[PDB]
Ligand binder design. Structure first.
Ligand code: RWV
Length: 460
């Protein structure tokens, strides 16, 4: 049986509004309803991995797992295996996989982050799961961020606390947060960003939704505008939204949005909004294609509608040569030429690099770079041709061209990372000097850039 080079992944997010689900929720897993929906001809074809995020989930883990497994069994006639389940308060993530994948999946991690302090600590935060699927690392985050139209900045803060403190993936990747630890990272949930239009315009917004005219609403969606201004989710993707706002509905129908202020809402308006979202970030030049992104129309127990997204995701096999794992393949090398980092920092420490990659036996520390002043104020750290030649464990080009090098630029004084980025080895040529580039981030914010040339030697 050949190892796959592509899998499909289902992502669901549903704020259940503290209510039990209805008896049938199959439309969710079938990507049926509004938006970018899945073809009927695919209904019986199981996805490889199903990742279900709930918020305001009133069920026990056992109760929800029985519902999910029953649902998938009905659709696919396959009995899925539980990879992981993790709950923080009423925020939950379940990962299910086809049984043929059970011995492809390893290094399963779970974690949670509680957001806020005192007043604001006790119900918002995130849960996450990571694992390896053969040679590919996969990470999944379900977050329930702060509510309320006038709290976008708090949501942005919640995002940065989650990506800083969620401890998933390979702990040896110490300089890297979750936004660099995975080949594919999916981040979804009740992100709680709202359509920022005046309260007076509620009925106008409703009219627009009934006409399926979302353009003038999406131009005011706080998540799209904050992302465009680089305030949140830097270097993440989201499919175009083509489904109606998923919040706030009257329960037991989808005919009415319940937007007016009530004691139950703390006297806050809930104008129709796209609270419920799926975003992703994959390493450069890895295959990832969104094949559905929408909301169900027939699941009406909550004041939110479920959201689905599905993806094709490239995966690689667990490579064994005669040499690596457990020795180098002298036929292989990575040379970083004429490299320099441009940093936004005002500090004047010396810097060194660390190169991390599962194609290396362990991470590689460079010598300190040479600091110069950029013409527009910046720090430029030059490494010249001084950088250590990296010796991958396997030289086979079918393996090496699919790998990535994580780079951290660290202060000599403090050993703290000032910036993190990633370089693909999916080059246009081997044994050839080629330009490379990554932005550098720290705590998910832009801190600089790294650029130069690479020369990759494989066994071919
Ligand atoms: C929130 C926004 N980000 C962009 C830039 N990105 C647009 C898509 C592109 C991938 N084809 C990567 C860069 C414009 S608005």
């Amino acid at each position: 049986q050949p190892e796959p080079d592509m899998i499909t992944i289902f992502i669901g997010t549903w704020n259940m509004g503290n209510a039990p689900p209805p008896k049938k929720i199959t439309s969710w897993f079938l990507s049926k309803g509004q938006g970018k929906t899945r073809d009927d001809s695919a209904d019986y074809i199981p996805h490889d991995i199903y990742v279900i995020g709930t918020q305001e989930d009133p069920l026990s883990e056992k109760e929800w797992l029985e519902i999910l497994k029953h649902s998938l069994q009905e659709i696919t006639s396959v009995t899925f295996k539980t990879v992981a389940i993790h709950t923080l308060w009423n925020i939950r993530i379940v990962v299910l996989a086809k049984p043929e994948h059970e011995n492809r999946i390893s290094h399963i991690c779970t974690d949670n982050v509680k957001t806020g302090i005192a007043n604001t600590l006790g119900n918002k935060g995130a849960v996450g799961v990571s694992f390896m699927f053969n040679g590919t690392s996969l990470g999944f985050v379900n977050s329930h961020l702060t509510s309320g139209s006038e709290k976008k900045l708090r949501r942005n803060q919640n995002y940065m606390n989650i990506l800083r403190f969620l401890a998933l993936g390979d702990k040896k990747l110490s300089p890297f947060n979750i936004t660099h630890r995975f080949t594919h990272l999916f981040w979804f949930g009740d992100l709680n960003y709202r359509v920022d239009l005046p309260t007076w315009e509620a009925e106008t917004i409703i009219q627009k939704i009934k006409q399926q005219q979302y353009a003038d609403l999406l131009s005011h969606d706080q998540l799209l505008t904050e992302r465009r201004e680089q305030k949140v989710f830097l270097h993440f993707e989201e499919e175009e939204i083509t489904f109606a706002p998923t919040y706030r509905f009257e329960r037991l129908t989808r005919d009415k949005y319940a937007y007016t202020k009530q004691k139950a809402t703390g006297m806050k308006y809930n104008l129709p909004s796209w609270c419920d979202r799926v975003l992703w970030k994959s390493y450069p030049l890895v295959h990832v294609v969104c094949q559905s992104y929408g909301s169900t129309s027939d699941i009406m127990t909550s004041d939110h509608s479920p959201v689905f997204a599905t993806f094709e995701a490239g995966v690689t096999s667990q490579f064994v040569s005669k040499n690596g794992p457990g020795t180098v393949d002298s036929q292989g090398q990575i040379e970083f030429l004429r490299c320099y980092a441009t940093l936004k920092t005002k500090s004047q420490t010396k810097f060194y690099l660390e190169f991390h990659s599962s194609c290396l036996e362990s991470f590689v520390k460079s010598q300190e770079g040479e600091n110069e002043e950029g013409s527009e104020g910046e720090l430029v750290v030059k490494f010249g041709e001084t950088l250590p030649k990296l010796k991958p464990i396997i030289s086979d080009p079918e393996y090496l061209l699919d790998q990535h090098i994580l780079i951290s630029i660290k202060s000599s004084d403090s050993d703290e990372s000032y910036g993190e980025g990633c370089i693909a080895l999916r080059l246009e040529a081997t044994e050839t000097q080629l330009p490379i580039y990554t932005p550098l981030t720290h705590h998910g914010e832009l801190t600089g850039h790294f650029q130069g040339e690479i020369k990759l030697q494989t066994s071919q």
